[PDB]
Nucleic acid binder design. Structure first.
Ligand SMILES: [Mg+2]
Ligand SMILES: [Mg+2]
Ligand SMILES: [Mg+2]
Ligand SMILES: [Mg+2]
Ligand SMILES: [Mg+2]
Ligand SMILES: [Mg+2]
Ligand SMILES: [Mg+2]
Ligand SMILES: [Mg+2]
Ligand SMILES: [Mg+2]
Ligand SMILES: [Mg+2]
Ligand SMILES: [Mg+2]
Ligand SMILES: [Mg+2]
Ligand SMILES: [Mg+2]
Ligand SMILES: [Mg+2]
Ligand SMILES: [Mg+2]
Ligand SMILES: [Mg+2]
Ligand SMILES: [Zn+2]
Lengths: 69, 91, 99
RNA sequence: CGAUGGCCUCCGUUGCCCUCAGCCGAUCGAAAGGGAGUCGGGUUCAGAUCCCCGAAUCCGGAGUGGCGGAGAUGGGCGCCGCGAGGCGUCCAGUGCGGUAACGCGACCGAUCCCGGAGAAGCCGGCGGGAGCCCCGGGGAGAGUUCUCUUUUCUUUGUGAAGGGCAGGGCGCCCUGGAAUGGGUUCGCCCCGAGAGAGGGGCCCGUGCCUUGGAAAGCGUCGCGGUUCCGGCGGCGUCCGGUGAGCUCUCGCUGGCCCUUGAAAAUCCGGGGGAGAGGGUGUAAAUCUCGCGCCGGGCCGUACCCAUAUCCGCAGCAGGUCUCCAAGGUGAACAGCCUCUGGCAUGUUGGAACAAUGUAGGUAAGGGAAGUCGGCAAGCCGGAUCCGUAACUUCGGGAUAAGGAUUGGCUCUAAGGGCUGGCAGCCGACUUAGAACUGGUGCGGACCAGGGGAAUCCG
């Protein structure tokens, strides 16, 4: 697993051809975006909430999204 | 305090092997375990590694020597005589 | 700092085999604070009776498990152990239910 | 040199010539030696590091290399343009930083040569880190409640692989030059061949945090499928402290040797500098950097592993190599009792309680008179405080011999850490002394040396 700490490189890895699916985990005080690539699983952690759901529509349309309920 | 009155390093042997044998090995054990002065670096760190190996703790130089002492009388006389032969041969 | 706990003996009182009275004075005699069971150790700990809802309030550290232990002692004393059982609905709460 | 294929470009495939050069000897020999790389959760009637789910990782391969990044893009001159910036000539460019230890994401290079790792005994002491045990609390669920008990018991977490930080070690570096010698260990040991004192660097970081990761696991309470369900829900998985404690592991240091305590496969670094690239760009050769693509064939895998799956003719009191190891007492992995786990008394039961047995005990008075012979049994036995002879190879004899004490309960005194001659706050077992007290009993079970004087032999 690899943690992504700045905002934009997460989208950069998300738009790679290798990426399979992104799953959204919504626990208290954190929001985790997990993108599954061939080699690693990249996790981006957002502390607040508003960045999270204004990014939720910024993922590429062709990439599968799964909300963990 | 003085623990033993006339037995030294061979006090570890208890009452075995005989007094004459024990006092014969006493001097050899003392010499073997003694630390000598390294003629190279001047430190007192010339300790015996094995039979005839004398290694310097800090100088990191090892020398071939006697089995129980760093030097041997035969060796020192031989060295002196050979030096004399060397100087006399070429004058 | 406030500590607040509740006891719900509603099922057995509506059934009609025990009443909340003996429960309440059992508490205000046998609650001991710093090991002294007299007069609740002063007004440091307060007891209140609602409709089959026994409320205990305090500020000195208190034990929800203390409360459970006392109600189990009551059940044994008045012979309800094989009928009733004390469980926890949520935090700061206990309630008595059947088997 | 000769021929072929692919846009015959550039390379591959050969066939011949030139040139280059050791083998320690074919080959076999370890399911405990060396040997890259997989962990967690779930699942069966019987299989799981192998199946499923999820996270990884090693090795090998690839015409066009799939891609980024590095090699890399600067300076001079004549210019244009107010400048910004843009033209035309030359020149460089196989990386950069730190005084140094060394650091940075890569940072060309052959035959050859050097070195390292693999690759090392036994014992002692100490320190660090885990697991376990222990103490004080918060929860959740159980047990007792004739009286008492804020009570007793169970449970209360995070993998591999990355990143960061503690914490350990350094025989690593820079400044400076020390006697009134200093630093320092349980012990040692260290220093003008550079100590103390400052400031750095490196290695291991199995610990903590984070990504994994709460989504899963577990403990409880409640609803479902009336079932065939990785069913669905609520809550919780918390805060601390100590220890010459035990086990494992890492590290430092010392002792012993007429004992010095493996080899090879495999891998890596360095010295050299034969070669290759391009003429200023669409830069090239080349990359042990990041990501991406493909594959990993063959054999074993069930179970027993022992008072019933092995060998003794057998379900034979024999024999047969290992890892894990709780609480109390206690020096103790001793003996005795208990918890997790296991078992049904060892190839039969019932009723009687004669002799003689086998295995345990106790005996008045005497105390070896028994017997070949104190055979057997019995006495002593731990610990603390006194005391300890002849002889001696001077080390021993020695726990010599011989004495006194030992319970319970209530106290006193001494022995430490952290924070701000003092004050406050925490604390772990010890040692000594005293009083009181019991039908003189106190190493109360268990554990647990009888002694002395001599002779012979070794
Ligand atoms: Mg072989
Ligand atoms: Mg092998
Ligand atoms: Mg220094
Ligand atoms: Mg959960
Ligand atoms: Mg098996
Ligand atoms: Mg029997
Ligand atoms: Mg039987
Ligand atoms: Mg049997
Ligand atoms: Mg039998
Ligand atoms: Mg008698
Ligand atoms: Mg008698
Ligand atoms: Mg007779
Ligand atoms: Mg006997
Ligand atoms: Mg004697
Ligand atoms: Mg004689
Ligand atoms: Mg003999
Ligand atoms: Zn020297």
């Amino acid at each position: 697993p690899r943690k992504i700490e700045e905002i934009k490189d997460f989208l950069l890895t998300a738009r790679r051809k290798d990426a399979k699916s992104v799953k959204i985990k919504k626990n208290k005080d954190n929001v985790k975006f997990k993108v599954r690539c061939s080699r690693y699983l990249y996790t981006l952690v957002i502390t607040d909430k508003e960045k999270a759901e204004k990014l939720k529509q910024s993922l590429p349309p062709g990439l599968a999204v799964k909300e963990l309920k | 305090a003085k623990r033993t009155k006339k037995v030294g390093i061979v006090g570890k042997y208890g009452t075995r092997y005989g007094a004459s044998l024990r006092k014969m090995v006493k001097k050899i054990e003392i010499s073997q375990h003694a630390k000598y002065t390294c003629s190279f670096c001047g430190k007192t760190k010339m300790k015996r590694r094995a039979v005839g190996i004398w290694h310097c703790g800090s100088c990191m130089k090892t020398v071939a020597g006697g089995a129980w002492t760093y030097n041997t009388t035969s060796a020192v006389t031989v060295k002196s005589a050979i030096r004399r032969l060397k100087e006399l041969k070429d004058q | 700092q406030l500590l607040k706990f509740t006891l719900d003996c509603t099922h057995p009182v509506e059934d009609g085999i025990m009443d909340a009275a003996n429960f309440e004075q059992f508490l205000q005699e046998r609650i001991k604070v710093n090991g002294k069971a007299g007069n609740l150790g002063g007004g440091v700990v307060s007891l209140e009776r609602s409709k089959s809802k026994i409320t205990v309030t305090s500020e000195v550290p208190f034990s929800k498990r203390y409360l459970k232990y006392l109600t189990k002692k009551y059940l044994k004393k008045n012979n309800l152990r094989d009928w009733l059982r004390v469980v926890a609905n949520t935090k700061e709460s206990y309630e008595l239910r059947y088997f």
